Design an enzyme around this catalytic site. Structure first.
Site, PDB file in Angstrom:
ATOM      1  N   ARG A  27       1.390  15.570  29.715  1.00  0.00           N
ATOM      2  CA  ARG A  27       1.032  15.088  28.283  1.00  0.00           C
ATOM      3  C   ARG A  27       1.445  13.525  28.621  1.00  0.00           C
ATOM      4  NH1 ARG A  27       2.924  20.008  26.010  1.00  0.00           N
ATOM      5  NH2 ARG A  27       1.253  21.151  25.652  1.00  0.00           N
ATOM      6  N   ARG A  66      -4.187  32.359  23.601  1.00  0.00           N
ATOM      7  CA  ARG A  66      -3.910  32.530  24.601  1.00  0.00           C
ATOM      8  C   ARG A  66      -4.538  33.760  25.517  1.00  0.00           C
ATOM      9  NH1 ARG A  66       1.876  34.321  27.033  1.00  0.00           N
ATOM     10  NH2 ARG A  66       2.466  33.583  25.012  1.00  0.00           N
ATOM     11  N   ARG A  70       6.132  23.898  28.562  1.00  0.00           N
ATOM     12  CA  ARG A  70       5.779  23.012  29.845  1.00  0.00           C
ATOM     13  C   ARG A  70       4.474  21.862  29.391  1.00  0.00           C
ATOM     14  NH1 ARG A  70       2.623  27.092  33.638  1.00  0.00           N
ATOM     15  NH2 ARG A  70       1.995  28.650  32.272  1.00  0.00           N
ATOM     16  N   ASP A  95      -6.513  26.144  26.463  1.00  0.00           N
ATOM     17  CA  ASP A  95      -7.053  27.635  25.994  1.00  0.00           C
ATOM     18  C   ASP A  95      -7.073  27.598  24.333  1.00  0.00           C
ATOM     19  OD1 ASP A  95      -3.953  29.329  26.905  1.00  0.00           O
ATOM     20  OD2 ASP A  95      -4.243  27.487  25.547  1.00  0.00           O
ATOM     21  N   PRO A 109      -3.313  19.083  29.303  1.00  0.00           N
ATOM     22  CA  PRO A 109      -2.761  19.609  30.504  1.00  0.00           C
ATOM     23  C   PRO A 109      -3.347  20.830  31.057  1.00  0.00           C
ATOM     24  CG  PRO A 109      -1.581  20.219  28.716  1.00  0.00           C
ATOM     25  CD  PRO A 109      -2.402  19.415  27.974  1.00  0.00           C
ATOM     26  N   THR A 110      -3.446  20.867  32.149  1.00  0.00           N
ATOM     27  CA  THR A 110      -3.911  22.174  32.623  1.00  0.00           C
ATOM     28  C   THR A 110      -3.248  22.624  34.191  1.00  0.00           C
ATOM     29  OG1 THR A 110      -6.126  23.541  33.007  1.00  0.00           O
ATOM     30  CG2 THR A 110      -5.743  21.422  34.120  1.00  0.00           C
ATOM     31  N   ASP A 140      -1.351  20.090  36.655  1.00  0.00           N
ATOM     32  CA  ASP A 140       0.237  20.195  36.764  1.00  0.00           C
ATOM     33  C   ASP A 140       0.019  20.672  38.439  1.00  0.00           C
ATOM     34  OD1 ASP A 140       2.550  22.802  36.281  1.00  0.00           O
ATOM     35  OD2 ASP A 140       2.488  21.226  37.771  1.00  0.00           O
ATOM     36  N   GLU A 188       7.612  18.042  19.848  1.00  0.00           N
ATOM     37  CA  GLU A 188       6.728  17.426  18.699  1.00  0.00           C
ATOM     38  C   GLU A 188       7.742  16.499  17.831  1.00  0.00           C
ATOM     39  OE1 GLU A 188       6.891  20.533  19.530  1.00  0.00           O
ATOM     40  OE2 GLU A 188       4.809  21.585  19.642  1.00  0.00           O
TER      41      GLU A 188
END
Lengths: 242, 242
Positions: A79, A221, A74, A106, A10-11, A41, A192
């Protein structure tokens, strides 16, 4: 041949975005038979990401799905978008070999990890560096089996592991079409465990990275970008994408 | 013959060190004819870095040099150590075409940049993303020539550029054996300019990245690692390197 490894990433648009995708792609590009599912997103594909993938030099699927008005975890929607594409991409034919893992844009990966997850039959796990407020997190292995968890955040979870610490067989994903990530949980890091509970048991878990004693993936990060001196009125004579 | 690219990378021991070194290597490993010069900021070589370079998968030189106490600059000693080493190895060679550049251990590189700096004759320059409080800084180019600088900081410097924004041919470094970075610079932000001044002129600079209109390198830093949950007393029975 070698089973295909699907990376769901996801980005979202932010100053460091292109840099993060650039170095992540530099790592993924070297993995044999890897397919990158990059999920933005956003309400529509951005030109930045579209241009990046076109020049990235590796097979990919460019998806996008907005995250509704959501310190909560988020990427849940992105996902799931990857999971949906996958389950839809593979027909109930006879060929469903492959594995998938979740890679934030990242996170740092050692090329050694992929040869590990490649053989996943059901669900494999491994140590993850710099997470949960500790130097690392890892499943405790006993005679080739997971019998516990070492983490600084909710160790009571039936699956106390981070998103970056596991891979799921494509067959398992296809066989469990209802299995998706649900953020409805009040507990931040419960996605998860709630997910994994629907596909396998701690006993079936396949320990990777030398019985979970090696860190081949780290949460990294980048710091917020300082734009205090960014011009607003006396602009540069050219437009540059960063 | 194919010119060799030397990457001078200063590094120091911290929780994210191995992670950062891992992804930078994942990038460099894909560049043809590139020699990585990793200089540790320590009294002596560290085992973590020594073992890492052994299995990094690319040609490298492991050096180390302490840095006195020193909001002051950094890596000055490490970068000079890299310069010395280069001048030493090529103290006197014939067919030895090469170019060097300075790559902090946390910066991001697009593979496209190497092809650019490869052909550097004297000194080449290019835009650098996420530096100086802006989205990017860059040399101003007119008719293939550098005629100015886009930066919100000390724009009057003869070379108002960032460390990650230029490359110098090996011959220029050899021809100017006394040209090194000066920590004694009482005036902040002058390291790059003071160095380049005694090495080349603005008129001789070779603009890269499409006449300095594309960003192929970025400054990126990982946030401080959170260890608020790192066990004080009890610990893991197994030693894990992160």
């Amino acid at each position: 041949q070698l089973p295909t490894i699907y990376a769901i990433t996801p980005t979202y648009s932010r100053p460091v975005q292109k840099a993060e995708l650039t170095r992540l792609a530099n790592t993924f590009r070297q993995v044999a038979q890897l397919h990158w599912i990059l999920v933005e997103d956003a309400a529509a594909r951005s030109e930045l990401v579209s241009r990046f993938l076109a020049r990235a030099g590796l097979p990919s699927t460019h998806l996008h799905v907005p995250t509704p008005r959501r310190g909560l975890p988020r990427a849940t929607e992105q996902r799931n978008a990857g999971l949906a594409w996958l389950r839809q991409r593979h027909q109930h034919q006879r060929a469903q070999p492959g594995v998938l893992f979740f890679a934030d844009d990242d996170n740092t990966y050692s090329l050694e990890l992929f040869q590990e997850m490649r053989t996943t039959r059901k669900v494999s796990v491994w140590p993850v560096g710099l997470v949960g407020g500790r130097r690392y997190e890892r499943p405790l292995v006993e005679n080739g089996k997971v019998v516990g968890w070492y983490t600084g955040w909710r160790a009571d979870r039936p699956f106390a592991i981070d998103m970056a610490g596991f891979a799921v067989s494509l067959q398992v994903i296809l066989s469990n079409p209802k299995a998706v990530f649900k953020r409805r949980g009040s507990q931040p890091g419960m996605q998860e465990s709630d997910f994994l509970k629907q596909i396998t048991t701690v006993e079936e878990l396949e320990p990777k990275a030398n019985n979970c004693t090696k860190v081949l993936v780290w949460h990294t990060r980048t710091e917020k970008v300082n734009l205090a001196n960014e011009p607003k009125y006396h602009l540069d004579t050219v437009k540059i994408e960063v």
